[PDB]
Amino acid sequence: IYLPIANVARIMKNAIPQTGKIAKDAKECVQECVSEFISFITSEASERCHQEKRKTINGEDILFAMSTLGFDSYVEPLKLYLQKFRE
Amino acid sequence: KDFRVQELPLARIKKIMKLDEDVKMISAEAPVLFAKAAQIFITELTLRAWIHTEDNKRRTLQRNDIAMAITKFDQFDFLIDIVP
């Protein structure tokens, strides 16, 4: 299961210059990548929660899993997006 | 901006998370964080693929531009199996 390709295409096209083009096969590929990004973080967060017999994956678990797996730079933006969101 | 991110289906994200064998309950916060994370990830992935698109003198970004970027960036090693 994957995020809608329309959503993925719009983020990708913001990333590149106006002039540029993205082949559908490169969009399908980023689609797959994103699902794997999620599953890989989730898997780390989840293995941690089980060790400390915790039944919910919380946001802190995710954020710590990112940090640990070398996505530490994602942490302040995510936190701020949370603040902003449910402010 | 952030609003593009608000359009991302949280249910779809919860459904992916739930594939994991050791995940029963998930806090609401989680899919939200992933929504934004998804945006940051896609952006950096494509910027980095774009380098290879241009080195090859094309204006079209292709699956092998992605594949090259995964190999030149240690943060994308978890993708080795996805993009051979």
């Binding site: 794997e36 599953s39 890989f40 898997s43 780390e44 293995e47 640990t68 797996l69 070398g70 | 994991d20 064998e21 240690d74 943060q75 090693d77 978890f78 080795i80 199996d81």
Partner: peptide, 18 residues
């Protein structure tokens, strides 16, 4: 291989096969 990711990557391979 990224040393931070390596163990998680080995596990995920097991999970996806299943």
């Amino acid at each position: 291989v990224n040393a931070k990711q390596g163990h998680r990557i080995x596990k995920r391979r097991q999970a996806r096969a299943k």
